[PDB]
Symmetry: C2
Subunit: 437 residues, 2 copies
């Protein structure tokens, strides 16, 4: 056959980043990179630097980057799927871990490599098949990723006593297993929930990752698969600061093993201020599809959106405190839509708000980035291919953010990052602090 | 009957703290309360202020305080159990929430009030009875607190749309339920695991909280119960910064409901750098009980501990970067031991290290707080009353830290604290930052 052996590459890359951080930290290390205010400290840590998350940086002129490789260079560069046009999430985890762009057989590797590592302990399987259909997917996804922790290699090698400098090699092995069992768990949370408890199927070492998943979800549409490949590539990662990424991080720094850290991250992503906004827009988009009715003019939604901005509401999906042009991940799923559902009524709706909304905002003071998110485009693209079941959308973001959160988990463990322990305070403390002192 | 109605008190206290924070933040609010370094930011946030956690402050001269009420004022002040000598965890949650010291019928209230709220959905019960006995308690405790999330009031009232200023009243209701179902869940993780899957029993509105628990654990010793009452009071809370407290906080700030935030906190407390040190000492204490043998002299453990400090090891349980005298929570369980197991061989072991260790360290440079933790005393006190099963110790700390973590959860939600979102960075970012800029 063929390849190049991921672990063995990462094995090489490690000492070189490990040093780079040793000198940096030697020399300028004490160079003050900012201040904290009594107000930030009530402000949920409002624009504090405190992380070092080495897999993605928000570029204000250019969206998000998976190195400096942004959005638009990824779609080019990342291997596409042996007869497709949209990237493999495989080759994206590979980029996130390596810093390098996969080769076809570096990706063909992972796919083989995920299919085998893809197995499920009879007790998560049982645990799923009895869960109540009143329990949310995301309470199931996280209940069962903890219960998968039964199987961690790290838990065990820890228990036996591996040493500091070896931690990555098994935290690696736990991550590669998790990202393989993930499709199974969610494919089954779907199937039990929404496709009347049927069988997820089997799993095919022939196919790539996203495919197997879509195939277990029970979807025969190769257009949907390639949306699945695209969706999973683009919601992977987003700086370290955000709830699901900071929790997998925080918790993972107590030397908790990847099953447990990831499950704790979904408990953050099931949180309304975090998971639920892909929905929020679809729902808005839904009332609007009624209130302003089917095939509107450029004049009537201008009337609606205007009568919306000014009568003391907001347009779900639009605006960004930093990013200066349109989010590339809107643009990616738009480019998709243009190709594959161009004359869709509801995509027609979204694509109209794109024409109209920015100017309406910009002209009406709510501005500086009046441009759309990702979250604005996606749900419309899900509902088209018949994924109506919108509570379940939060799991699909979960299975995606997995690649980005676990691929930095190996790195915090490789560069051997400390237990995360900011100082708390208390108001009475503070009152004596800033002013009285 | 009799009482005073907790929710209704807290209802009163709220606006007054709510303002106090409005003015403080009005005026000095921008007063800079510290700086951040490139080095802190790799240093897992090494002595950053970033939290406001209003239920406990570390006093360096005086241990931990549950206001300014420290250790020693609590044992006095907190109601003791209608024929006991050790405080009720009931009256401690009450202190943590109110800021005020319970009255007997404020506590008698909670006990009644926990017993009724104490019920368990048939699906967590099933989920427990089939869990594998190879799955850790703490992967079970957290799997089933997520699955209890099926029952959150907040989840629902959120779903229906309560408004900002009402959030506490239901986040309250979810917390009071959780702390009542907790005994049931852990009593059953024990029983299934270690007491051959037997029945937890029933639940008695007559008895107080810790009692019911010990009674479901299946322990007939009223000395053990009162250890249980003491244990649960003292490991409740410990500033906000620590893994289990920061995670329940972080995650709970994405508007996740208390079941989900607490379950995510245990995924942090199951982490080796966090849960597992109560054990670590018992295990040390165990080898020593052999290597230096039964009834040693003040001269021979001096030899051991000295031959330990100098031959390049450390004494599990001893030392503290801040606290200047002996941790009161050593002293609390020592005072206990003195009373109730005075002539215990292994307590004799601990109490000897107390005589010997500090001076041996102090004289041998490893000093400034050479004094013992809590974690040093507890496990010895557990093993005596026949709680041999030491993997399960992490759940008993869980059920304790619950009171302190949930009682500040109501407060972050009451004072309406924002989604927690520090800025990440990246090394390449940093290199350009501190020096190049």
């Amino acid at each position: 056959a063929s390849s190049t052996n991921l672990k063995d590459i990462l094995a090489d890359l490690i000492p070189k980043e490990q040093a780079r951080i040793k000198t940096f930290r030697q020399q300028h290390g004490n160079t003050v990179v900012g201040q904290i205010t009594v107000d930030m400290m009530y402000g949920g840590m409002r624009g504090m630097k405190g992380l070092v998350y080495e897999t993605s940086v928000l570029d204000p002129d250019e969206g998000i980057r998976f190195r400096g490789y942004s959005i638009p260079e990824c779609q080019k560069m990342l291997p596409k799927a042996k007869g497709g046009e949209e990237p493999l999430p495989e080759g994206l985890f590979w980029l996130l871990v390596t810093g390098q762009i996969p080769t076809e057989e570096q990706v063909s590797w992972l796919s083989k490599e995920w299919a085998k590592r893809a197995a499920l302990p009879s007790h998560v399987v049982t645990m799923l098949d009895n869960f109540p259909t009143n329990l949310h997917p995301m309470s199931q996804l996280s209940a069962a990723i903890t219960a998968l922790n039964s199987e961690s290699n790290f838990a065990r090698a820890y228990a036996e006593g591996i040493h500091r400098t070896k931690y990555w090699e098994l935290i690696y092995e736990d991550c590669m297993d998790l990202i393989a069992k993930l499709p199974c768990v969610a494919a089954k949370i779907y199937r039990n929930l929404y496709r009347e408890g049927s069988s997820i199927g089997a799993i095919d070492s022939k196919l790539d990752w996203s495919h197997n998943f879509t195939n277990m979800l029970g979807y025969t549409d190769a257009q949907f698969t390639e949306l699945m490949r695209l969706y999973l590539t683009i919601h992977s990662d987003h700086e370290g600061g955000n709830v699901s990424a900071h929790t997998s991080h925080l918790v993972g720094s107590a030397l908790s093993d990847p099953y447990l850290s990831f499950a704790a991250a979904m408990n953050g992503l099931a949180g309304p201020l975090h998971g639920l906004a892909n929905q929020e827009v679809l729902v808005w988009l839904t009332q609007l599809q009624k209130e302003v009715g089917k095939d509107v003019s450029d004049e009537k939604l201008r009337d609606y959106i205007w009568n919306t901005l000014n009568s003391g509401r907001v347009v779900p999906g639009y605006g960004h405190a930093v990013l200066r042009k349109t989010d590339p991940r809107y643009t990616c799923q738009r480019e998709f839509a243009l190709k594959h559902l161009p004359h869709d009524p509801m995509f027609k709706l979204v694509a109209q708000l794109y024409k109209i909304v920015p100017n309406v905002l910009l002209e009406q003071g709510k501005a500086k980035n009046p441009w759309p998110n990702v979250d604005a485009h996606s749900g419309v693209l899900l509902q088209y291919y018949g994924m109506t079941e919108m509570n379940y959308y939060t799991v699909l973001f979960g299975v995606s953010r997995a690649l980005g959160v676990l691929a930095q988990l190996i790195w915090s463990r490789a560069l051997g990052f400390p237990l995360e322990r900011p100082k708390s305070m208390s108001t009475d403390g503070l009152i004596k602090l800033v002013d009285s002192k």
